[model samples]
Target chain A: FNCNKREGPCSQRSLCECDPNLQLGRHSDQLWHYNLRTNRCERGGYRDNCNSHSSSGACVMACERI
Target chain B: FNCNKREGPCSQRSLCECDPNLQLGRHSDQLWHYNLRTNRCERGGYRDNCNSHSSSGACVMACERIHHHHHH
Candidate 1:
């Protein structure tokens, strides 16, 4: 739902079932994160650079710390 | 062209001649401006919410500021 926590419980997909409508779209290394303030699924950078959830990686199941 | 100026020397259009293709798009009152740092025309808030430029008026002349704003 919210990525404010330290990459806790989250899902990885082209679009997650988050509250609004969050997607896994990326630009270069940038990823999508739920912006609490804006309440918009705006583009942003991943803090840990998501080693999992791409084609096949750590972010496979987790939110990948974006 | 780059809205860095104090609301001066700018033309209104669906798309601006800025480096990264800035446009006068809007979502509600959120106006899209050319973020100099990003080098890409990302969305941002309007300080004045564009009173002069609108379908009726200022924004009509200077990039009325945003229609399908941030549909991305």
Candidate 2:
């Protein structure tokens, strides 16, 4: 189950298999993370950190590469 | 001519007459000023200050808000 590769939404718990075959555009360039714990993105630690778990949306209208 | 009111870029030297009639949406919400004197926006007296001369671009999709935030 990949979001970028499928051009759609995928659960954060699902495996993230982003690849070049999906042709993600701007959505690929956007940085996404489910760490919106408070009013801001969560940071620190591997469990819920911006640098550790931060990813992106799909690769089509949902996500892009540049 | 006013930039926001005229829906275009106005010289910092020109008059700033921002209003709702021109339909300045996000551009109106942006905060700007030509003070890149030394690789950084000048901040001092009215002649070179943020609050004194800061203005906006046209009422189109020129500038927006939410840039930075740091304690001073």
Candidate 3:
């Protein structure tokens, strides 16, 4: 059964599917996230729904090549 | 006399001439600065040499329309 409370299994593809509108709250740590649409790791905030990486290299390794 | 230590008068054009390579240090506030070359207000860090605006709207007001000669 699908649990709404659970975040489900970690999927690399799902991680890449981050929302452009969603961002970390003001004064939050600067992070890198993969933009599936642009195919680039851009600097910004992150949400739980998406994979937030500490660096661009990590984001590239997780999503760009895939 | 030209003073090297001083930042000179605040010029709108100079403010827009932000260096693409320059960025605010990590954990710093996320601010918007005008990119003169791209002709767009992009989010990034700022240095004393360039104008650092608190919002994109402020950056746009200072630089974007400069592309076209619109009398304010």
Candidate 4:
């Protein structure tokens, strides 16, 4: 019997796997772990990247990237 | 006792509920809202709708359908 995946906070690009060939992004934490491979950040993580506030739907990121 | 269902920067499906009809699709934020019926844009607000940003088949939460929490 297959169980559901454990839910935790991460970048948006790393979660929505709902079918065959499911894909997820890098696993991370408060540091905003981005996939060096994909050269991309998660959804909510992006907001944190561009604003200083905590991850919020209306939230933005914190600093600039290179 | 029940919460007013408040979470900062609200998003996600707000899951892990209990009871006969446990459901959670609202009480969040972050443009991840969507409802084809209710005109909701949750479930990551339809992101990756055609694959743009997030919702990399990981999560499109905010897909808060009023009665879409089908679980067992």
Candidate 5:
């Protein structure tokens, strides 16, 4: 799955379900991490100041197939 | 200690460890949180765009006993 890039559908308030194996990196406030392990969405090493989400309050979500 | 509010002296490139009980918040690029309980610094729920510190590189550090990274 992908991160809440727009934060519209999800509002970037919830967490992104990423893979359990892959290492996610936060590229930007609009981006989440993609793990290959569980194939789910995870936290990335993106640049952030305060709000965990993008635009101070917006992001996407993505999970792996079970 | 406090966070590197200004992108000077100590850059925000490193991590700021808060008190075990204190809960720090990022009000701005130069602001940080402080817990009154443990009297330590913490990672407050602030709003950020990019860069771990500020200005893409800068932050202060005032650690407590020991901490690795942000857990929750």
Candidate 6:
């Protein structure tokens, strides 16, 4: 339930479970998202409601196990 | 034969012809690259020597039709 500046109001760690490549579009921004598959933050199109972060640091803070 | 910030030293429009999905790796940064397939800038892994850009505007500036041409 933690949050950060780059994340949206409804963003949550649970949203990090979503695939970064899902709902891709031509108009999307190149943002960082936690890739559960790789257990790492990756750059890709932004997914609404998927808790995409604007930076690797934000994604790590929200999802990385450490 | 032009250059811009965010783009690497050897970056060129010819490199934009490369595939964005090629040579992907987990360690790569999520960066903007001109996707020749879509004719639009897309967010993907940084491709070395592929003229990847750090912003959509930069990708468009280097590869879009306004500055270059594509079949589709």
Could you tell me which 10 consecutive residues in candidate 6 chain B have the lowest summed lDDT?
Answer: B2-11
| Higher-scoring candidate on TM-score, 2 or 3 | 3
How well does candidate 5 reproduce the true complex, by DockQ? 0.04
- TM-score for every candidate vs. truth? 0.18, 0.16, 0.37, 0.22, 0.21, 0.36
- For model 1, the stretches where C-alpha displacement exceeds 4 angstroms are A1-8, A11-29, A47-66, B1-72
- Runs in model 3 with CA error above 4 Å? A1-66, B1-6, B23-29, B67-72
Candidate 1, residues A1-66: lDDT per residue as tens digits? 433112322223322334322222222232333334443444443332221111111112223333
Worst 10 residues of 4 chain A by lDDT: A48-57
What does candidate 1 score on TM?
Answer: 0.18
Please give the range of 10 consecutive residues that has the lowest summed lDDT in model 4 chain B. Answer: B45-54
**Per-model C-alpha RMSD:** 16.7, 17.7, 16.6, 12.2, 14.0, 12.0
Tell me the tens digit of each residue's lDDT in model 1 across B1-72: 334222322223212334323222222232333433332333443322221111111122223224223222
Candidate 3 lDDT over residue span B25-71, tens digit each: 33224556666667787876433233544345445655675422342
Predicted complexes: DockQ each: 0.01, 0.02, 0.02, 0.09, 0.04, 0.03
Candidate 5 Cα lDDT to native: 0.29
Error of 4 at A34 (Å): 10
Q: TM-score chain B for all models.
A: 0.25, 0.20, 0.59, 0.19, 0.21, 0.58
lDDT by residue (B1-72, candidate 6, tens digit) is 322212322324444765565542332355566667667877754434344444454456556743365333
- Mark the regions of model 2 whose C-alpha exceeds 4 Å error after superposition: A5-7, A13-15, A20-22, A27-66, B1-72
Report model 4's TM-score to 2 decimal places: 0.22
Off by over 4 Å in 5: A1-34, A38-40, A43-66, B1-13, B17-39, B47-62, B67-72
Candidate 1 structure lDDT: 0.28
Over 4 Å off in model 4, which ranges? A1-23, A26-66, B1-8, B11-33, B38-53, B59-67, B70-72
**Candidate No. with top TM-score:** 3
